[PDB]
Amino acid sequence: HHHHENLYFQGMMKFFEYNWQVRDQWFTWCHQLTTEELLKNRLGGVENILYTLFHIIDVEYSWIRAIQGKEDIAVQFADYQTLNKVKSLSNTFRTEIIDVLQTHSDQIKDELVSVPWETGVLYTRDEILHHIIAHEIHHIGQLSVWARELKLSPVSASFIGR
Amino acid sequence: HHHHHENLYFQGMMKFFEYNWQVRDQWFTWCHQLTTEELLKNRLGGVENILYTLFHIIDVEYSWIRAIQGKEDIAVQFADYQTLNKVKSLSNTFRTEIIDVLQTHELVSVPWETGVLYTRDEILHHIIAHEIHHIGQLSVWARELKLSPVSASFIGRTLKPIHSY
Ligand code: NI
Ligand code: NI
């Protein structure tokens, strides 16, 4: 027996869909820069454009893996030093991320999740999902400043009109 | 009488507002260490200065909430709020009204956009993302000023419920 998608889950998913679409637009935007430009350290967040994108991807997937209760296994930025490799990494985890989100879509939103990198700490599914959502929008906001510093128009962050 | 039951959707969206309001208030506190020069200085990215970024965040949020409420307002002019204290007071004034609108439980027309109507849900998503986006811009400027930005972490933060304001 199947149930209709609950409103809470649809509202949370709209943020994910928004984030993923915006991210893809930043990947396209990054194509106009050299790998040196993409890797150049600047002030703010995790300091370079390419590592910011990697970091977003990394953190999102690490929390989704914690929700699944799988072993940590942290991908290393050293193995993803180009726009194409970071874009491929984003694609590699997407289907797993979607399946996990769908699998944890019920009304038991205070489901407890153990944090492999914090001994004796638990967060709820609800907390983690809010955190993941805010995390990407936050780092993407940082990219928009560096975009104007490079004298380039940023990708729009508007939720409406998508 | 009738049995109640918690609105999971509603509480889910409110945790973003709670997070945003707490983060914003910490940025208002962060701004006290800056000079009026540093606060108003034009920088690259977004709406270009720290004080105007905070003003823009509160203006956009209140305008949409007012659209949801069905009420229209005369544009608040940044020229009338050129100090940190004035922008903080405006933030608190708008918040009082916003809490009432969120605590009350159709399609929303906007005075600016003719021929389009939005769901309340669409608007809440837009408001939430809009603040987090601009706040992200402030963290870059913070590091450019050789200052530590305010935390953006959702996790590990005690959220004050909307009803506790
Ligand atoms: Ni981060
Ligand atoms: Ni804006």
Swiss-Prot record, chain B:
It holds the Pfam family DinB. A divalent metal cation binds at H56, H130, H134. Keywords: Metal-binding. GO terms for molecular function: metal ion binding. Transmembrane segments: none annotated. InterPro entries: DinB, DinB/YfiT-like. Gene3D superfamilies: dinb family like domain (1.20.120.450). The keyword Metal-binding applies. Belongs to the DinB family. This is Uncharacterized protein YizA.
